[model samples]
Target: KVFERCELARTLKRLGMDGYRGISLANWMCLAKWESGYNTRATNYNAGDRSTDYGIFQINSRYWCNDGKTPGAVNACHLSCSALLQDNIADAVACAKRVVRDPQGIRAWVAWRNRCQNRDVRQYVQGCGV
Candidate 1:
């Protein structure tokens, strides 16, 4: 389920993620763009670790999700990774909230660290005004 980037930004704001979850909506939108290109069905396989990252947040099997095929998964979210890959992103959003609670904060996302950190990031909300 690919979403229009502008609509996704609006939805994230409507869901109250703008500066409310120890993260800014613009940063979240930026991370989503880099991680999954706003596609719900995105999945990336890390053959070296025999793991996968799922959904827009790129929630990982290494610690946060279980894809079943990926053994020794920590499955911290206690839900199948598939749950994050849907047009409705509630599950993925919830899991991302949990991730931000970690000590790493949004730094848990390498894309955010690389592309969003210390950057103004306002362009992510260019049209949404979120």
Candidate 2:
């Protein structure tokens, strides 16, 4: 099912998507909104060339998922970029778990750095009692 912001937060916590490594519920919620506005069909390119984002989590084609566009694209999560666009967020969640282990952890996302960094986003999930 498509999830609203708070619902998404609740599900993320329930599934422990936010518990990967150092990821937190607040941070994960913030990143989702900043990346996809909680829309599963969201797709956009990173400002940098040969890079794209997908799904509610905005998995990156630059290093996270493969779109067959980036010659040396890492596709570190072993996911097809298109797979992240489905209504189901399961793959996106799994890939994000892998992403959190990267050197930067949750901050690997530029959106996190620019918007979520050093911020308390607890309110993002407070309505859902997360």
Candidate 3:
């Protein structure tokens, strides 16, 4: 797995792959596990149409390209260059970092995963490091 690659880890660390400012590694790991089962090739199956969302994080190509020019172009360029869709954990992690570091609004990514549902997710986030 590229995620297990030393170079990738070094790159991510250098790019500040910290938890949700308050979330822990374990919590992130849990979310990642549930989100895509750590499978870089994981995809989502559509029950009604039998369509699919491809790649590790199950990124729908349509929505994945919605981040505007920089990140969006980067995503599009990378996708065009390779058959291995969301296999780029470095990019995914970078994008995730951006999502977590959102300065405005409610930071829905963190809120949905860490605070919604009577704070169950927040509690789980707290248990990650300890």
Q: Number of clashes in every candidate structure?
A: 0, 0, 0
lDDT of each prediction vs. the true structure?
Answer: 0.87, 0.83, 0.44
Decide which is better by TM-score, 1 or 2.
1
User: Candidate 1's error at 104, in angstroms?
Assistant: 0.1
RMSD of each: 1.2, 1.7, 7.1
lDDT of 3 at 22: 61
lDDT tens digits by residue: candidate 1, 7-31: 9999998787787557888899999
Encode model 2's per-residue lDDT on 72-124: one tens digit a residue. Answer: 78888998898899887888888998888878888788888998888878778
> What residue runs in model 2 are displaced by over 4 Å at the alpha carbon?
46-48
Better by lDDT, candidate 3 or 1: 1
Model 3 TM-score is 0.46
Write the number of the candidate with greater TM-score, choosing between 2 and 3.
2
**Ten contiguous residues with the weakest lDDT in model 3:** 65-74
Measured with C-alpha atoms, the lDDT of residue 34 in candidate 1 is: 92
TM-score of each: 0.94, 0.90, 0.46
